[PDB]
Amino acid sequence: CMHAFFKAMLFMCSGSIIHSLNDEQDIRKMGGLYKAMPFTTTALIIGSLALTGMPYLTGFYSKDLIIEAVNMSYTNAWALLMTLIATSLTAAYSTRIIFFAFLGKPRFPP
Amino acid sequence: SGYTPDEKLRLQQLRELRRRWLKDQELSPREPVLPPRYKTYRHSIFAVTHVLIPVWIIHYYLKYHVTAKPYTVVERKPRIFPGDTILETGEVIPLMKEFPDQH
Amino acid sequence: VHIEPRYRQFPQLTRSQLIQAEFFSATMWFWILWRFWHDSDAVLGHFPYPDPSQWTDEELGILPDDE
Amino acid sequence: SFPKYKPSRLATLPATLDPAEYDISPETRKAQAERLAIRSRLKREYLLQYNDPNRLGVIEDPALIRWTYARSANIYPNFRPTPKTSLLGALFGIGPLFFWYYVFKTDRDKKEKLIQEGKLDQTFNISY
Amino acid sequence: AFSAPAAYLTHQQKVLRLYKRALRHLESWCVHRDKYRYFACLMRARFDEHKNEKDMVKATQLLRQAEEEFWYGQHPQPYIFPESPGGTSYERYECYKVPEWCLDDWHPSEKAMYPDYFAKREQWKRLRRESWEREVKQLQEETPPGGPRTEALPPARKEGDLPPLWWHIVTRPRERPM
Amino acid sequence: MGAHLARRYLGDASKEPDPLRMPTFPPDYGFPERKEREMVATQQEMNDAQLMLQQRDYCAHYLIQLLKCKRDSFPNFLACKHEQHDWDYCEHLDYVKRMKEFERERRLLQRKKRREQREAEMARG
Amino acid sequence: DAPPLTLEAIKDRVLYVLKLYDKIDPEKLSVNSHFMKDLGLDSLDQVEIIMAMEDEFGFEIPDIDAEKLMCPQEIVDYIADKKDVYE
Amino acid sequence: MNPFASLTLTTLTILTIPIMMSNSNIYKTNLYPNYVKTTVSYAFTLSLVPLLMFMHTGQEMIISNWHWMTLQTVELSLSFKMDYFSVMFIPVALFVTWSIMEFSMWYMHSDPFINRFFKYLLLFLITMMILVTANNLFQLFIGWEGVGIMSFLLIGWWHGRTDANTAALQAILYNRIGDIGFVLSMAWFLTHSNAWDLQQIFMLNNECPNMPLIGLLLAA
Amino acid sequence: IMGFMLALELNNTTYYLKFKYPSQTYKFSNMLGYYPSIMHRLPTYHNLSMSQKSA
Amino acid sequence: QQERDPWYDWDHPDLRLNWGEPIHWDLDMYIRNRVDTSPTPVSWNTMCKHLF
Amino acid sequence: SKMELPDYKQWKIEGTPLETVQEKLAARGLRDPWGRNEAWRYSGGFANNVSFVGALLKGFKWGFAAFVVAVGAEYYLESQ
Ligand SMILES: CCCCCCCCCCCCCCCCCC(=O)OC[C@H](COP(=O)([O-])OCC(O)COP(=O)([O-])OC[C@@H](COC(=O)CCCCCCCCCCCCCCCCC)OC(=O)CCCCCCCCCCCCCCCCC)OC(=O)CCCCCCCCCCCCCCCCC
Ligand SMILES: CCCCCCCCCCCCCCCCCC(=O)OC[C@H](COP(=O)([O-])OCC(O)COP(=O)([O-])OC[C@@H](COC(=O)CCCCCCCCCCCCCCCCC)OC(=O)CCCCCCCCCCCCCCCCC)OC(=O)CCCCCCCCCCCCCCCCC
Ligand SMILES: CCCCCCCC/C=C\CCCCCCCC(=O)OC[C@H](COP(=O)(O)OCCN)OC(=O)CCCCCCC/C=C/CCCCCCCC
Ligand SMILES: CCCCCCCC/C=C\CCCCCCCC(=O)O[C@H](COC(=O)CCCCCCC/C=C/CCCCCCCC)COP(=O)(O)OCCN
Ligand SMILES: *P(=O)(O)OCC(C)(C)[C@H](O)C(=O)NCCC(=O)NCCSC(=O)CCCCCCCCCCCCC
């Protein structure tokens, strides 16, 4: 349920960016959208925070409990390690989207 | 390296024809000649039809046809807790024993 | 509202969208702070974790080695 | 220097890395010219028929006709029983049948042995 | 696309195509504009360094080594314009492209809904029918006896003619048809 | 995760406890008089409350009280904080008792190792 | 959605890019100037000019076609033809 | 009768309604996207109601309304499982679909077949609801393959794009290997338990074996 | 937070006027682990080849 | 056909074929919707080794 | 309607990373002629942009003020 919420919102913000930039889907050609597009910027930031498990957003009440249960169970050691690394990589690619789409100077056509 | 004179001339002529063709593709003020033959009100007609008629039909179907045969609608029995009042028989489910309470 | 296209310039923005974005970012941060003020146990835990080293052999029912 | 690229059948060699692209002979140039002339002749024929204002229908493609004929109706006349053909046919047409026969025969023999010995869980198996 | 290809690519053409491809992939690696400008100037410096070279054997060997270097260092996921062959918007509007021969099968009522358009269309059809013989005659007069040696087509040499084989080029569907 | 895993794997698995076989010592071994655990909720009460089979542990009475609280104050979904805390505290006490069982098993195992080493040395000497 | 292109708009944008090119003198640049016959550039300069136009208008000109555009007017005509611009 | 069954079935039915109207002047007009969006909004509210009913007393039901066919000792009927999972996932899915339909009304504004796009979105929603509320394996499989084929149709939305067509067929291929696993599970359950419905499956499988559970895992 | 910090450092490194050829790990990650390439060219090719040459 | 040039004015733009030219025996499996043999940035052997 | 292109003389690389690039190239003995055509991106409303941490804290200032006011009101109500 929680993932339905914030992932749908993230895809809608991505689509808004695509439409405003003439069907461009490359973060290498996005840029400056933090100030260019205020509402989609704040929506995508809130969604990416909720995705990564901000302490009291919609993703905290599921992902945090899942990680707690995985750590506290009689589990596969390799599965536990891969789960933790995947949480780190989730934060990583959310950072990549934000950094390459919204921060910096523009790269889109004039 | 560049256009030959024949390539340049043919491109010029073809582009002139193409522009003329698109200009002809433009429509006329009269062109789509069709043959002869409040916000709350719209959602009020929508709500009665789309919500009211189906709910009437479905409630009639369930109350008088589906639930007229055994085991068609099975409900999970309600939870009963200590110190409860069973409404069916006016019964009283007793409370639990005293907890060994801490702090 | 009609937004005129810009060429090599920052696009025209709207007061409504600026205030809406600011209000919702502020709403998220207020919610996070308000939840942390009240429900801080969800992040930092609620009950202490016992140290098994401090449990006496008498209370764990371990007899002296010689016995 | 840089690691070399090894072409495969499913990842072919790029044209820019082909050694023959940088060793061009005067006969290579005339081969290219002849190929371009063939393409130009075919293109002229197709374009004339294509832009004909009076043509209605399908421009028949002899290449397509030959391809469909070679794929179906010309195979048996040009087939000969060779050792390779016989072995490949025997394998691909007989090996799978006997492999599956052995698999199913063994499985059903085990099932029937368990049934006869009366130690196979057949409870609730009403529908057969 | 619009231009007929030749039998082979010259050495200069190969060098320029490598230059453009290398700059595009360098831009894909160097996401930011300042970094791209810096490294693009360095790349042009390398090309200008080898610009003057009389030994064509050495020039071809340089091109071959440059191609190997490019293949090793190319971006696995280079930037592609949306409408370009690898792009995301490539061939999206092909299902919306319908031909004018499909247009002329309309019912009379449908055609009656657009009286002015179809008069101009009839004028275009008459213009096409009145020129076909001159077009074929011009094509068969100017060809060599062996046949067409290339895919290029001539223009109209006279004041009343049209460039031979022009109908589908001129009346091709629009890039955004619907 | 924890240091017990390192001790068992990169160390003396004979001295460390085995979770899938614990306990291996009698419950009264070293306990002169040991009292059994008390169960407040009865089988019929848990069956009526329709507790999940993994929720029918020794803390089930606080869970039943929490469920009854949440049902009665439905629209106010923030009115059973005390019942939630009572259930959580009972679960915490149960967990620390499990931890005590593990630690008892560990030091009993190492006491047995020491005793058998002492017997082996006495026999050798 | 997006405003349609016009011949004047395309011409303005191409001349704008060319005036922002440093190797072209903006005073003697016209819509009929040849990149090499009367501006003194070379093949690499023309390649960079075409790439700049590709970035400007957001589409790609294939190498077979781009090697022939030796004039801002030729570039304008090519882009108008490709974008179906007639006005 | 309690309003639980009536309101759940009403949500499903009013979802199906605009597909019936896909052969009318409204489907020929430009009000069809807004019509479908309004329908999804109303269905979302009517689904919110039984969620409140469950959140109070934890009420769950199964509705075997229509009997389809009796294969000797196996009875197939149209049954719906309105439990915690269904009554929680339906409002979430409807809320998300409502927002997505509005965003598509803005986003697909220039699409010549926006009405067909909205009809396809509503058909996917219907199949997903069938999947979620299904009480037997056969109805669950109907929803399974329905969402698979709607995904196929919507991925290849632009038919002139070869990449779109390859992507659609690829999705079909992988989901079809999943369906191999699903059908293995269905055959095992019928053969060894004489049932395709979750009640009898759960009652009779005190310890489920590797073969059916691995079939389910492969399908998932 | 460690993922945030490491990703941010790596992304800030992109501004430097330093160019380096990609790594094997980068190629593996960017090309999807080579799974679509190998497993969309090899088994499909063999199945479509058997479907004609043999059957 | 994926390896065939995309910028050329083919008679069949989607199939990337010209009218009258010989058709490969396995065109049915070498269409752009099917098996692709285009060159890849990494060698096929390296791909296999890394994946396995 | 009918937008006007801003005058091209206004685009300069001074006070821009492009002039740092130009200085490095000049030290190396080179020049880049496309400086201004890129220099449009570094001026005007694109001149200053936030950092990654400053982006995450977009509404923290007003959110914290509202939080302090609400905590004060709650404490006031609890006291009286
Ligand atoms: C667009 C619609 C169609 C869509 C499908 C289209 C494609 C298929 C077409 C059909 C193909 C097959 C053809 C078969 C022909 C034979 C027909 C037949 O056998 O019909 C069977 C059957 C008839 O059975 P029967 O044996 O004849 O009668 C048994 C009883 O005696 C009956 O009990 P009774 O005596 O009480 O009778 C009640 C009575 C009266 O009903 C009522 O009273 C009910 C309504 C009560 C309303 C209450 C409120 C009233 C208003 C208020 C009044 C007071 C004032 C208050 C004011 C308040 C103001 C605020 O109504 C009827 O009798 C109606 C019977 C059915 C009539 C229609 C039959 C049409 C056949 C046409 C065939 C044509 C050829 C087809 C093929 C052509 C080629 C394609 O009819 C139906 O099944 C009809 C529908 C049943 C009810 C609705 C069920 C809802 C289920 C919901 C499930 C949701 C699932 C969602 C899943 C997806 C989302 C997840
Ligand atoms: C067969 C092996 C199977 C292994 C299975 C298990 C796999 C586990 C994977 C773990 C994560 C690996 C992440 C890197 C892989 C992708 C690299 C890449 O291409 O990035 C470009 C990509 C950017 O793409 P781009 O902008 O296009 O860049 C293109 C450039 O050309 C730049 O391109 P580039 O290629 O030049 O940049 C890569 C370069 C620079 O990137 C990095 O160094 C990435 C960051 C590595 C961080 C490692 C941990 C550092 C410490 C973290 C904190 C924990 C320590 C304690 C701290 C205090 C705690 C109280 O790194 C390397 O080349 C070294 C190798 C990287 C890691 C390899 C892992 C093993 C697989 C390969 C084995 C063989 C490798 C041989 C060497 C390569 C071939 C010659 O990077 C990112 O977006 C950042 C991702 C990396 C950071 C994410 C956050 C941390 C990740 C988890 C670390 C652990 C956290 C705690 C977990 C829970 C513990 C309980
Ligand atoms: C159980 C039944 C058999 C299962 C294994 C079947 C393997 C072979 C499948 C049939 C071969 C396909 C025949 C012809 C299909 C057409 C091929 C085709 O269309 O091309 C590939 C097409 C598109 O190519 P693109 O890469 O997207 O091109 C991009 C364009 N630039 O994509 C595909 O269809 C690839 C399909 C390859 C199948 C291989 C996958 C097999 C994986 C099985 C692993 C199972 C593990 C599951 C875990 C279970 C846990 C208990
Ligand atoms: C793991 C998959 C195995 C499939 C089934 C197992 C059967 C064995 C595998 C194939 C062996 C032969 C089966 C039929 C194949 C025919 C051979 C063939 O196609 O080539 C014939 C050669 O055959 C002959 O004419 C002589 C007949 C026997 C030679 C080939 C069979 C030898 C097989 C070796 C036996 C096994 C070796 C054991 C090694 C250890 C294995 C555990 C013609 O030669 P060419 O003109 O070059 O045409 C090929 C074009 N590239
Ligand atoms: P214009 O007609 O003036 O063009 C002049 C040319 C170049 C045609 C000359 O007249 C000419 O033919 N000169 C001699 C031939 C020649 O130039 N040979 C050398 C050309 S290749 C060269 O040496 C440059 C290669 C260096 C760059 C390699 C690119 C690889 C990097 C790719 C990286 C991709 C991701 C970063």
Side-chain angles (χ1 to χ4, degrees):
Chain A
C1 301
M2 311 307 171
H3 173 263
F5 273 112
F6 58 76
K7 193 50 69 64
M9 180 181 52
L10 279 178
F11 251 120
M12 290 202 310
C13 303
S14 159
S16 164
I17 295 175
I18 293 172
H19 191 277
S20 307
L21 288 187
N22 196 344
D23 289 350
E24 180 75 41
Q25 306 183 359
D26 214 314
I27 63 180
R28 287 175 281 186
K29 289 285 181 287
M30 279 106 81
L33 307 177
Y34 178 87
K35 280 195 54 193
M37 318 181 63
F39 190 80
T40 51
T41 300
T42 192
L44 198 139
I45 284 176
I46 296 179
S48 68
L49 281 187
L51 163 71
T52 62
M54 194 66 186
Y56 292 98
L57 298 185
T58 196
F60 169 78
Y61 291 85
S62 52
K63 177 186 292 187
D64 185 64
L65 293 184
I66 290 177
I67 300 304
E68 289 183 359
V70 176
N71 280 111
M72 294 274 291
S73 304
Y74 187 100
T75 43
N76 199 273
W78 197 241
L80 174 49
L81 195 61
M82 292 307 104
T83 308
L84 299 181
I85 299 175
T87 302
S88 292
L89 291 170
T90 299
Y93 63 67
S94 159
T95 307
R96 145 170 280 257
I97 286 187
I98 286 180
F99 181 89
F100 279 100
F102 294 97
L103 304 176
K105 301 300 169 302
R107 272 104 56 186
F108 46 81
Chain B
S1 176
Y3 288 117
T4 67
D6 286 10
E7 287 180 355
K8 254 293 190 66
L9 194 60
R10 181 187 174 85
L11 269 193
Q12 168 186 2
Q13 300 167 345
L14 288 173
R15 294 206 257 252
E16 175 168 359
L17 284 169
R18 170 65 163 178
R19 293 178 180 180
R20 187 142 52 94
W21 168 260
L22 297 174
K23 165 68 62 180
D24 297 1
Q25 295 307 281
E26 282 179 357
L27 279 200
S28 290
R30 65 185 276 261
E31 193 80 309
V33 178
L34 299 178
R37 285 298 88 188
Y38 195 79
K39 183 179 299 179
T40 59
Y41 166 74
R42 299 184 62 258
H43 280 193
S44 296
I45 299 292
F46 181 96
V48 290
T49 303
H50 278 70
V51 173
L52 204 50
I53 290 181
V55 75
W56 279 342
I57 296 175
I58 291 178
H59 189 52
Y60 180 93
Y61 175 58
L62 289 172
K63 179 152 86 170
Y64 293 114
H65 290 109
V66 171
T67 57
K69 316 199 71 161
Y71 300 154
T72 50
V73 175
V74 195
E75 310 171 325
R76 174 177 177 178
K77 55 176 191 178
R79 309 166 89 106
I80 301 305
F81 310 113
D84 235 8
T85 300
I86 302 308
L87 212 155
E88 173 205 19
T89 60
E91 196 181 351
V92 176
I93 302 300
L95 291 79
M96 280 180 291
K97 55 188 296 297
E98 311 286 348
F99 302 159
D101 174 63
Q102 51 268 5
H103 60 47
Chain C
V1 61
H2 189 254
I3 299 294
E4 290 291 336
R6 300 276 184 83
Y7 180 75
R8 301 210 179 200
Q9 282 158 340
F10 190 81
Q12 180 196 351
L13 292 186
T14 313
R15 181 187 174 274
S16 66
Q17 65 172 160
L18 291 168
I19 65 178
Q20 277 176 348
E22 278 297 336
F23 170 81
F24 279 99
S25 301
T27 302
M28 185 204 65
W29 274 113
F30 167 84
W31 180 246
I32 295 174
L33 290 175
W34 177 264
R35 286 265 64 80
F36 187 75
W37 179 265
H38 290 69
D39 309 319
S40 47
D41 296 355
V43 173
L44 307 178
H46 194 353
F47 305 107
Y49 192 63
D51 190 60
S53 307
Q54 320 286 35
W55 286 329
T56 75
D57 300 60
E58 313 297 332
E59 74 176 326
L60 289 193
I62 272 70
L63 292 182
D65 202 333
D66 52 70
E67 171 175 1
Chain D
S1 186
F2 308 110
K4 200 185 62 74
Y5 176 73
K6 271 285 303 303
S8 175
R9 69 145 60 254
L10 298 177
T12 56
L13 185 68
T16 63
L17 267 50
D18 176 52
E21 222 75 18
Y22 306 97
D23 199 331
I24 307 122
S25 178
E27 299 82 19
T28 299
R29 288 277 176 258
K30 76 176 304 179
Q32 295 169 341
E34 291 176 5
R35 292 164 187 154
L36 179 63
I38 302 178
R39 294 177 59 101
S40 314
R41 176 177 57 79
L42 294 171
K43 195 59 161 286
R44 176 62 53 87
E45 182 172 1
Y46 169 77
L47 286 182
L48 280 170
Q49 304 180 39
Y50 184 39
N51 294 264
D52 198 353
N54 318 118
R55 179 199 54 88
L56 176 65
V58 178
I59 304 183
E60 185 191 14
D61 194 358
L64 193 62
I65 298 296
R66 297 187 210 101
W67 178 59
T68 65
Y69 186 81
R71 279 287 297 265
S72 64
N74 191 247
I75 285 188
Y76 195 83
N78 302 322
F79 146 78
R80 305 177 296 103
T82 64
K84 169 185 173 65
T85 305
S86 310
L87 283 179
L88 290 173
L91 187 69
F92 285 112
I94 299 177
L97 297 181
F98 277 111
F99 168 75
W100 288 119
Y101 167 74
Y102 180 76
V103 166
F104 290 119
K105 188 69 171 55
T106 299
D107 171 70
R108 286 189 55 84
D109 287 5
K110 294 182 177 183
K111 182 207 308 291
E112 189 69 11
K113 176 180 54 61
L114 292 176
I115 284 289
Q116 295 291 341
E117 295 170 348
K119 57 180 191 183
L120 191 52
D121 199 18
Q122 223 177 23
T123 178
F124 312 138
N125 297 24
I126 297 186
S127 302
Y128 65 107
Chain E
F2 292 107
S3 306
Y8 60 96
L9 291 172
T10 65
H11 174 83
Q12 169 220 11
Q13 286 179 341
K14 296 189 187 72
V15 164
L16 297 170
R17 285 157 205 263
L18 175 61
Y19 181 61
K20 182 171 176 185
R21 206 171 50 245
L23 279 193
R24 287 306 188 189
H25 282 257
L26 190 63
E27 180 182 347
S28 294
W29 279 126
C30 302
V31 172
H32 313 288
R33 302 312 306 182
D34 47 315
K35 186 175 171 178
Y36 164 60
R37 286 267 60 89
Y38 180 80
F39 286 111
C41 193
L42 305 193
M43 186 79 69
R44 186 179 213 278
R46 302 184 55 185
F47 276 88
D48 275 1
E49 151 183 6
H50 289 305
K51 170 188 53 180
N52 290 324
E53 174 62 37
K54 296 305 185 181
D55 198 2
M56 294 306 301
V57 175
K58 186 185 177 183
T60 307
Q61 189 61 212
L62 287 178
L63 176 67
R64 179 172 175 178
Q65 295 179 178
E67 294 281 9
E68 288 175 16
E69 172 180 1
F70 166 85
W71 191 265
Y72 168 71
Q74 51 164 150
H75 200 316
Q77 204 176 18
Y79 171 77
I80 310 174
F81 290 98
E83 311 288 342
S84 281
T88 58
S89 301
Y90 185 54
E91 287 175 335
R92 293 215 313 209
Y93 315 95
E94 305 295 329
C95 59
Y96 307 131
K97 291 183 171 64
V98 194
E100 81 292 338
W101 66 254
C102 209
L103 188 62
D104 60 50
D105 288 337
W106 276 21
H107 194 256
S109 57
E110 287 187 297
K111 300 188 176 183
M113 278 201 304
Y114 295 86
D116 293 324
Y117 180 81
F118 278 92
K120 312 177 199 305
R121 186 170 192 268
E122 284 301 324
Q123 290 179 194
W124 274 99
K125 294 160 68 67
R126 251 190 299 105
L127 175 63
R128 179 196 191 178
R129 279 190 278 95
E130 283 178 356
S131 179
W132 179 241
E133 307 299 342
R134 302 195 303 268
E135 294 178 23
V136 297
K137 215 178 191 310
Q138 166 161 353
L139 280 184
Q140 64 190 21
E141 282 179 349
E142 304 189 0
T143 41
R149 296 292 297 178
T150 180
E151 287 174 15
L153 289 164
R157 318 287 188 174
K158 302 195 298 189
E159 55 197 11
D161 288 19
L162 303 170
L165 307 184
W166 62 270
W167 173 260
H168 289 91
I169 293 168
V170 163
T171 66
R172 60 183 190 276
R174 292 187 277 103
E175 208 197 11
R176 301 302 177 87
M178 298 184 179
Chain F
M1 313 193 295
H4 57 108
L5 297 176
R7 297 195 303 263
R8 188 187 177 195
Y9 296 152
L10 319 174
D12 217 343
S14 55
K15 296 196 304 179
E16 288 285 332
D18 191 4
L20 296 184
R21 213 147 292 97
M22 180 193 330
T24 185
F25 296 90
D28 287 4
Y29 182 82
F31 273 105
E33 198 284 330
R34 206 175 167 187
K35 292 177 56 61
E36 304 82 5
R37 298 188 64 175
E38 179 198 21
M39 187 59 191
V40 173
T42 49
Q43 291 185 283
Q44 184 55 35
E45 282 172 351
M46 298 190 302
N47 190 287
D48 294 3
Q50 291 180 22
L51 262 40
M52 232 164 290
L53 283 200
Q54 81 270 353
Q55 290 186 337
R56 302 188 182 188
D57 50 358
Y58 277 87
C59 321
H61 42 286
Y62 290 115
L63 176 60
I64 286 173
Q65 196 176 228
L66 168 62
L67 298 172
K68 183 175 183 57
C69 176
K70 295 190 70 60
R71 186 191 65 184
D72 299 357
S73 58
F74 155 58
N76 191 11
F77 56 96
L78 310 167
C80 302
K81 301 299 184 181
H82 187 250
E83 291 75 16
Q84 186 71 60
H85 182 272
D86 286 339
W87 187 38
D88 285 358
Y89 191 58
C90 202
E91 292 297 331
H92 163 75
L93 298 187
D94 183 57
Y95 194 77
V96 314
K97 295 181 58 165
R98 296 174 61 187
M99 293 180 58
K100 289 185 184 184
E101 293 280 350
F102 182 93
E103 188 65 23
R104 164 174 206 270
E105 166 87 359
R106 178 166 79 106
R107 44 183 68 167
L108 280 187
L109 279 176
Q110 66 199 11
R111 196 187 80 110
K112 260 51 182 61
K113 279 300 177 179
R114 284 196 296 267
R115 291 179 69 260
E116 83 177 23
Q117 290 175 19
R118 178 185 52 81
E119 277 190 347
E121 292 170 350
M122 284 191 176
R124 172 66 272 185
Chain G
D1 203 11
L5 276 165
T6 56
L7 300 174
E8 185 184 344
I10 301 180
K11 168 187 175 178
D12 292 0
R13 297 226 254 156
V14 305
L15 291 174
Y16 202 86
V17 178
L18 289 175
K19 288 178 295 185
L20 292 167
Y21 196 18
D22 272 355
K23 297 188 181 184
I24 297 186
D25 187 2
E27 318 301 334
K28 71 169 186 177
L29 167 72
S30 62
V31 85
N32 294 314
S33 290
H34 191 295
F35 293 146
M36 314 163 179
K37 293 183 184 180
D38 46 55
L39 292 186
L41 309 173
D42 64 350
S43 56
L44 304 180
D45 299 354
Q46 203 260 358
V47 168
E48 298 176 356
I49 279 171
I50 293 305
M51 296 206 319
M53 296 308 176
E54 292 181 4
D55 300 350
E56 173 84 15
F57 289 92
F59 70 98
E60 187 184 346
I61 313 183
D63 281 301
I64 177 67
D65 295 351
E67 291 175 350
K68 305 182 188 301
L69 309 183
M70 292 295 172
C71 180
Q73 182 62 53
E74 295 177 14
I75 304 179
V76 170
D77 295 335
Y78 185 98
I79 296 175
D81 191 69
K82 200 174 189 309
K83 295 271 162 285
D84 303 323
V85 172
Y86 54 98
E87 285 169 328
Chain H
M1 278 239 314
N2 48 14
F4 206 75
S6 309
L7 289 167
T8 53
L9 289 195
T10 314
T11 60
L12 307 182
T13 297
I14 69 194
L15 284 192
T16 62
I17 290 188
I19 308 302
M20 303 165 170
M21 298 267 83
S22 68
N23 63 340
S24 301
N25 174 69
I26 183 180
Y27 186 77
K28 292 300 175 179
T29 53
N30 59 285
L31 309 180
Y32 192 75
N34 181 259
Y35 167 62
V36 175
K37 185 206 61 178
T38 298
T39 315
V40 180
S41 305
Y42 282 52
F44 160 73
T45 62
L46 278 192
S47 70
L48 274 188
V49 176
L51 178 59
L52 290 183
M53 287 190 175
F54 171 86
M55 282 178 170
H56 178 197
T57 55
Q59 183 173 17
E60 304 176 347
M61 299 185 326
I62 58 178
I63 305 153
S64 301
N65 50 280
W66 184 54
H67 173 271
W68 194 32
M69 62 181 171
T70 303
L71 300 325
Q72 297 130 50
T73 36
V74 189
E75 283 186 327
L76 268 60
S77 54
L78 186 73
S79 36
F80 302 94
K81 195 171 185 309
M82 305 306 186
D83 64 328
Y84 161 59
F85 294 146
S86 309
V87 309
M88 178 65 64
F89 184 74
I90 288 179
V92 180
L94 288 171
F95 194 67
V96 175
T97 306
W98 171 23
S99 303
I100 294 294
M101 279 181 177
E102 208 187 9
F103 164 81
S104 329
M105 203 183 316
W106 168 77
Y107 187 86
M108 314 288 303
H109 69 286
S110 61
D111 197 60
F113 302 99
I114 184 183
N115 296 13
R116 177 188 301 171
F117 188 77
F118 274 75
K119 186 187 56 185
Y120 281 5
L121 293 182
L122 192 56
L123 280 175
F124 161 78
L125 180 54
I126 293 160
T127 50
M128 194 63 206
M129 297 297 100
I130 292 177
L131 193 164
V132 169
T133 61
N135 188 38
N136 53 278
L137 272 182
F138 191 86
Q139 192 179 332
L140 183 41
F141 191 54
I142 297 178
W144 207 259
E145 303 278 12
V147 303
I149 208 59
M150 292 314 302
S151 175
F152 167 83
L153 290 183
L154 278 169
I155 295 168
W157 179 249
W158 296 293
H159 318 279
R161 192 172 152 80
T162 303
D163 299 350
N165 291 323
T166 68
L169 194 50
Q170 172 177 353
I172 277 293
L173 186 157
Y174 285 112
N175 299 338
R176 202 40 66 111
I177 304 181
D179 301 338
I180 297 174
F182 197 107
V183 173
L184 155 71
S185 176
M186 287 182 65
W188 193 97
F189 276 135
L190 195 122
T191 293
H192 290 260
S193 172
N194 211 30
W196 271 340
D197 65 326
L198 302 178
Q199 286 76 35
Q200 185 164 348
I201 292 179
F202 295 155
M203 198 66 213
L204 292 188
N205 302 277
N206 184 25
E207 42 100 4
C208 190
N210 293 346
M211 181 172 295
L213 283 197
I214 294 173
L216 290 170
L217 173 62
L218 173 59
Chain I
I1 298 175
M2 269 301 176
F4 270 116
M5 292 170 54
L6 266 297
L8 187 49
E9 296 174 5
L10 266 297
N11 291 325
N12 282 324
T13 308
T14 56
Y15 287 101
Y16 305 159
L17 300 185
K18 178 57 179 62
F19 183 82
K20 218 286 181 179
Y21 277 151
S23 183
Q24 304 276 48
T25 308
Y26 178 83
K27 295 175 183 177
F28 184 86
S29 191
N30 178 269
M31 305 185 67
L32 311 184
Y34 307 126
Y35 190 97
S37 310
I38 303 294
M39 299 326 296
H40 294 192
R41 298 182 183 195
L42 184 72
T44 70
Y45 172 84
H46 282 329
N47 190 261
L48 290 174
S49 185
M50 179 273 300
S51 314
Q52 194 266 317
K53 293 185 176 62
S54 303
Chain J
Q1 319 303 126
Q2 192 65 66
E3 304 190 50
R4 290 218 177 181
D5 191 26
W7 285 113
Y8 175 68
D9 188 288
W10 302 104
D11 293 335
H12 310 298
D14 50 336
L15 295 193
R16 288 180 188 171
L17 287 171
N18 271 9
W19 177 95
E21 71 176 37
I23 296 183
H24 188 26
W25 178 273
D26 287 322
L27 174 80
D28 200 5
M29 67 138 68
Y30 284 149
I31 51 173
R32 296 167 59 199
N33 311 72
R34 248 106 186 264
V35 185
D36 184 2
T37 75
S38 60
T40 53
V42 184
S43 194
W44 177 276
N45 303 84
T46 301
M47 294 182 162
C48 289
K49 293 173 203 303
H50 287 7
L51 181 60
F52 168 81
Chain K
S1 303
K2 188 55 178 186
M3 76 169 185
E4 180 65 28
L5 266 59
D7 187 56
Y8 76 95
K9 307 175 179 302
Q10 70 173 104
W11 305 122
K12 300 182 178 65
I13 63 179
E14 281 73 43
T16 292
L18 295 162
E19 83 162 353
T20 302
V21 172
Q22 188 58 272
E23 287 168 357
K24 293 205 59 180
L25 289 177
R28 223 165 188 274
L30 309 177
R31 283 194 70 261
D32 57 329
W34 302 100
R36 302 175 270 130
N37 192 28
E38 307 297 321
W40 83 262
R41 310 181 178 279
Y42 293 82
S43 61
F46 309 114
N48 301 114
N49 205 334
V50 305
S51 52
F52 183 80
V53 176
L56 301 187
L57 307 168
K58 178 173 176 170
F60 185 87
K61 169 189 166 303
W62 280 301
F64 187 86
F67 166 71
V68 166
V69 170
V71 164
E74 188 187 21
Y75 182 78
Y76 185 85
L77 288 185
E78 185 270 351
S79 301
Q80 72 94 12

